[PDB]
Structure formats: C-alpha cells, structure tokens
C-alpha cells in the first residue's frame, strides 16, 4: 500500500514487499545432506503451496 | 498499509513486508545432516502450506 | 501500490516488489545432497504452486 | 624422531610434526577488522620470522 | 624420521610433516578488512621469512 | 624419511610431506580487503623467503 523508506545521508536501505532480498555476505559449507524434500542451504527464500 | 521507515543521517535501514531480507554476515558449516524433509542451514526464510 | 525508496547521498538501495534480488557476496560448497525434490543451494528464491 | 600414532579400531587420528592440520568444523563471521598487519580469522596456523 | 600412523578399522587419519593439511568443513564471511600486510581468512597455513 | 600411513578398512587418509593438501569443503566470502601484500583467503598454503 503506502510502504516507504525515507531518509537522507544514508549508506544502505531496502524496501522489500513480498519477495526476497539478499544484500549481505554469506558462506555455507555442507558436507552431507540426506533425505528427500530437504532444503540444504537457502539464504533468501519464500515458499508456498 | 501505512508502514514507514523515517529518519535522517542514518547508516542502514530496512522495511520488509511479508518476505525475507538478509543484510548481515553469516557462516554455517555443517558436517552431516540426516533425515528427510529437513531444512539444514536457512538464513532468511518464510514458508507456508 | 505506493512503494518508494527515497534518500540522498547514499551508496546502495533496493526496492523489490514480489520477486527476488541478490546483491551480496555468497559462497556455497556442498559435497553430497541426496533425496528427490530437494533444493540444494538457492540464494534468492521465491516459489509457488 | 620416533613419533607414532598406534591404536586399533579407531575413528580419527592425526600425527602432525611441525606444521598445521585442520580436521574439524569451523565458522567465522567478521564484520569489520581494522589496522595493519592484523590476522583476522586464521584457523590452523604457524608463523615465523 | 620415523613418523607413523598405524591402526586398523578406522575412518580418517592424517600424517603431516612440515606442511599444511585441511580436511574439514570451514566457512568464513568477512565484510571489511583494512590495513596492509594483513592475512584475512587463512585456514591451513605455514609461513617463514 | 620413514613416514607411513598404515591401516585397513578405512575411508580417507593423507600423508603430506612438506607441501599442502586440501581435501575438505570450504567457502569464503570476502567483501573488501585493503592494503598491500595481503593474503585474502588462502586455504592450503605454505610460504618461504
């Protein structure tokens, strides 16, 4: 509707609506993931039906 | 509806609505994850039906 | 509707609506992912029916 | 000289001599490291002159 | 000289002499490293003159 | 000299002499590394004069 990100003299700013936003550092190191229907290393992530 | 992030002379600011936002540092190191239907290392994450 | 990212003298800024945005550093290193219907290393990610 | 790792029916075993060995899980997440000549996140590590 | 790794019915075993061995999971996520002559994220690591 | 890795019914085993061996999972995600003569993300690593 009326979402807003208002400022001045900033560095970073985000306004997501209903999705996914990834803007940072990340590191994953699996070694073994078993089973079916398994999410292993998901960072920014939405999911429905 | 009327969500808002209002300031001045800032550094970081976020306004999520209904999703996922990741803006920080992260590190995961699994070694073994068993079973089915298992989420292993999820950082920003929503989930439904 | 009326989404907005308003500032001045900034460095980075994002306004997603309903999708996915990836603007950061990421590193994944799996070794073995088993099972069917498994998401292994998804960074910015939406999903429906 | 006469270093030795002797056993039976074991799982893990290591015999380092004078170096570095890393065989475990680790996770580091800095955010800001300042200064010169600084070691930030070192896991297995020797150092001389 | 007479270094040795002796066993039976094992899983993992290492015999380094004077170097570096990395056999484990690791994850590093810096964001900002300053200064000159700085080691940031070193896992298995020897160093001389 | 007389270095040795002796076992039976094993899974992994290493015998380095004087160098570097990397046999594991790793993930690094820098964002900014400053300065001169800086090692940023070194995993298996020896170094002299």
Numbering used by the authors:
A (entry chain B), B (entry chain C), C (entry chain A), D (entry chain F), E (entry chain E), F (entry chain D): 50 to 98
The authors write:
In this work, we determined the cryo-EM structure of G51D fibril strain prepared in vitro at a resolution of 2.96 Å. The subunits within each protofilament stack along the fibril axis with a helical twist of 1.26° and helical rise of 4.86 Å. Residues 50–98 of α-syn form the fibril core (FC), and the rest of the residues in the N- and C-terminal regions are relatively flexible in the fibril and invisible by cryo-EM imaging. The G51D FC consists of six β-strands (β1–β6) which arranges into an extended serpentine fold. In the WT1a structure, G51 is involved in the steric-zipper interface of the two protofilaments formed by residues 50–57 (50HGVATVAE57), which is assumed to be disrupted by G51D mutation. Instead, this segment with G51D mutation flips 180° perpendicular to the fibril axis and forms a β-hairpin structure with residues 60–66 in the mutant fibril. Meanwhile, V74, A76, and A78 that used to be buried inside the WT1a FC are exposed in G51D FC and form a homotypical steric-zipper interface to bundle the two protofilaments together. Thus, the replacement of Gly to Asp disrupts the β-turn formation and leaves the entire N-terminal (residues 1–49) flexible and invisible from cryo-EM.
α-Syn is a highly abundant presynaptic protein in neurons.
